[PDB]
Amino acid sequence: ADLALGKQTFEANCAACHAGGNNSVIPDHTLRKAAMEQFLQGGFNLEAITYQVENGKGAMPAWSGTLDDDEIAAVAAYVYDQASGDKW
Ligand code: HEM
């Protein structure tokens, strides 16, 4: 995965709501591994993350009409990497 692209895509598009890997809209639905295991539909895995970034969920906007496939893949990988290595 192009983690470099993923990080810049993250800062540019997701940081207002998830700065520090947290969540400013619904505080407990952070991007930490344990939180995603509880709140992310499908659990903590790349497929679940990609699905939500593409399709959206409630106050979480859908990005399929803003970011392209290679950009979505990149950002999903970055989020997974950050969570599993707890790099936030
Ligand atoms: C940017 C493109 C972006 C990413 C990446 C992203 C990811 C993401 C994940 C993986 C979750 C799940 C967290 C969990 O614990 O279940 C999640 C959830 C929400 N998001 Fe998000 N998100 C991105 C962008 C944005 C933006 C710009 C906003 C703010 C307007 C935002 C908000 C939210 C909200 C609210 C949720 C919770 C969804 C729900 O379960 O109801 N995200 N995001």
From Swiss-Prot:
Post-translational modification, as annotated: Binds 1 heme c group covalently per subunit.
GO terms for cellular component: chloroplast thylakoid lumen
GO MF annotations, alphabetized: electron transfer activity; heme binding; iron ion binding
GN (gene name): petJ
Role this protein plays: Functions as an electron carrier between membrane-bound cytochrome b6-f and photosystem I in oxygenic photosynthesis.
Similarity comment: Belongs to the cytochrome c family. PetJ subfamily.
Sorted UniProt keywords: Chloroplast, Electron transport, Heme, Iron, Metal-binding, Photosynthesis, Plastid, Thylakoid, Transport
Pfam families: Cytochrome_CBB3 (PF13442)
Name of protein: Cytochrome c6
Main location: plastid
Lineage of the species this protein comes from: Eukaryota, Viridiplantae, Chlorophyta, core chlorophytes, Chlorophyceae
One of the GO BP terms on file: photosynthesis
Origin superkingdom: Eukaryota
Subunit structure: Monomer.
Sites where the protein binds heme c: 14, 17-18, 60
Record's subcellular location: Plastid, Chloroplast thylakoid lumen
